Design a binder for these strands. Structure first.
Ligand SMILES: [Mg+2]
Ligand SMILES: [Mg+2]
Ligand SMILES: [Mg+2]
Ligand SMILES: [Mg+2]
Ligand SMILES: [Mg+2]
Lengths: 130, 46, 95
RNA sequence: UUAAUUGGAUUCAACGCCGGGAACCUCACCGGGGGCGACGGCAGGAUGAAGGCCAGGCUGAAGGUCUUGCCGGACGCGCCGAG
RNA sequence: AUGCCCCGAAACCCCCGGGCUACACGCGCGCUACAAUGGGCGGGACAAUGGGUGCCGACCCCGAAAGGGGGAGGUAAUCCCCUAAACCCGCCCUCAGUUCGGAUCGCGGGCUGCAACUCGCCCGCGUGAAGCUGGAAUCCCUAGUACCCGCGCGUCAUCAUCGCGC
RNA sequence: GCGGGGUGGAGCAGCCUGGUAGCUCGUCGGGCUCAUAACCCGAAGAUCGUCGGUUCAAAUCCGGCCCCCGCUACCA
């Protein structure tokens, strides 16, 4: 219980596995996305992760495609996302494969509440507007 | 226990479906301007 | 950023104590001398001023003692907003 | 509360109302990137303006710019008024 | 459609990602219940308005279910949507927070889409919250009308607790 | 002489005749109204100064005590 096993297959046991034999080990949504092909932008992004995986492209990977499905290629490195105004780092670990990329870059600031004002109740609605 | 560890697993990686489990809020995309009032009333003046 | 009635020109900050009557407002500013604000006629219609409302006024170079004149008010979304910037210290309102 | 949580309507006669069940568009809102001056005159222009591309950087992605040099064959927001 | 005043390399025109779906809280209109004037399981009965060529799909075959692979006939009183539900008979439950009530959550399978995390809809197993008839107040209805039960168009690539009709 | 008040933000009930801590001005919410005051309704708020006895069982019977006290004056 220190190694990670997804469906009985270790990381480097599945790291060399294919992409059509892979999808039988993912839930519906990701199996279907892997079956209607990848979008053009995600092609352009995989063709920048693989270079950054061999020896080249030692430069921060950025993106707008929050839809990309994490895969056994991306385990280990640290890529960015775009949560609306800025690029936020997501250090990819195992136990993320299957989830969505944008799933880890939240998008609305947590809310903390002040105090009710003029109109929050029927006792301060017409007693203010004269 | 199995459900609990399936929740902790989402708490680790800091997903979006794990933080809602943290703060005790809806999880499956509901709206909350109007329902889910598990708190206590607030006053202004009288 | 934000458009707030800062001191522009020679403006003053009016935080009133009592309305003696007929529009006279004794104001308690950080300056010290008892100033007595009065009101123009453009706002006497649509707005509603009382005590505790920190607002902006304008003083007059005559005797610099009992002066002030409303030109614009403050809404509850600004009166305490103006604390974090420290543009005004609220302890000129509790002593 | 927020980077933005776009606006109009407040008794009858405002609140499943604007045919408003908004993933993109609709979109008017916050972050970023790029294009647009019929027409009269000005610096300039066949010793070649406006204007376009294989490949590579910057970039979220882009001949959008720059590196690189190829092409096209008359006009000209680099300047003023107008539209 | 339109007068006046501001923008005029921008407040004009396109493209990618976010928001309108944020949540201590007050309110308007509705849907499901608090059970016997009922819940479940197996059988038996009877409609009307409307719509279809970017579309409606009979019939056959795979699947437990959502759905999938083929595919006649239809530019319409011809073919299709389209053997409705409340109702009846037979057996289990017997007044209990229950065989009432199904919110909230975990895992797995699918459809539309250029794209389902923020934020779509549908299926199977599991967990099983408040709720035991509602204070002062207030609304709609005079006959095939009120109440009770289902259906069709609109919006629509998918999604109806809504609007307008039966 | 020594004894009393010991309790919601408060004001006092409320004993002996023991089992709702009780009514009123206040506090926040909702009604009524074109809107405000008055009027109707709902919840929140001390849980009896405290140990101890009685008591099946206590503001409710009382004592011990902690606090506030309290009706009262040089006594040649
Ligand atoms: Mg949009
Ligand atoms: Mg809205
Ligand atoms: Mg049931
Ligand atoms: Mg989704
Ligand atoms: Mg009133």
């Amino acid at each position: 219980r220190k190694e990670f096993r997804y469906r009985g297959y270790t990381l480097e046991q599945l790291m060399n596995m294919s992409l059509e034999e892979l999808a039988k080990l993912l839930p519906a949504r990701q199996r279907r996305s892997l079956k209607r092909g990848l979008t053009p932008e995600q092609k352009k992004l995989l063709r920048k992760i693989r270079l950054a995986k061999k020896g080249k492209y030692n430069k921060p990977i950025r993106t707008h495609c929050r839809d990309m499905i994490v895969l056994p290629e991306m385990v280990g490195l640290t890529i960015y996302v775009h949560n609306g105004k800025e690029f936020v780092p997501v250090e990819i670990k195992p136990e993320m494969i299957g989830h969505y990329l944008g799933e880890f870059a939240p998008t609305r600031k947590r809310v903390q509440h002040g105090a009710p004002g003029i109109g929050a109740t029927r006792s301060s609605m017409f007693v203010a507007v004269k | 226990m199995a459900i609990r560890e399936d929740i902790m697993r989402l708490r680790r990686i800091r997903a979006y479906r794990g933080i809602r489990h943290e703060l005790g809020l809806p999880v499956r995309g509901q709206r909350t301007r109007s329902n889910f009032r598990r708190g206590q009333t607030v006053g202004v003046s009288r | 950023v934000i458009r707030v009635p800062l001191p522009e020109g020679n403006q003053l900050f009016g935080v009133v104590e009592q309305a003696l009557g007929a529009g006279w407002m004794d104001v308690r500013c950080e300056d010290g001398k008892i100033r007595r604000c009065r009101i123009p006629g453009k706002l006497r219609r649509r707005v509603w001023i009382r005590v505790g409302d920190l607002v902006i006024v304008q003083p007059w170079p005559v005797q610099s003692d009992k002066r002030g004149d409303i030109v614009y008010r403050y809404t509850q979304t600004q009166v305490d907003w103006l604390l974090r910037k420290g543009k005004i210290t609220q302890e000129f309102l509790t002593g």
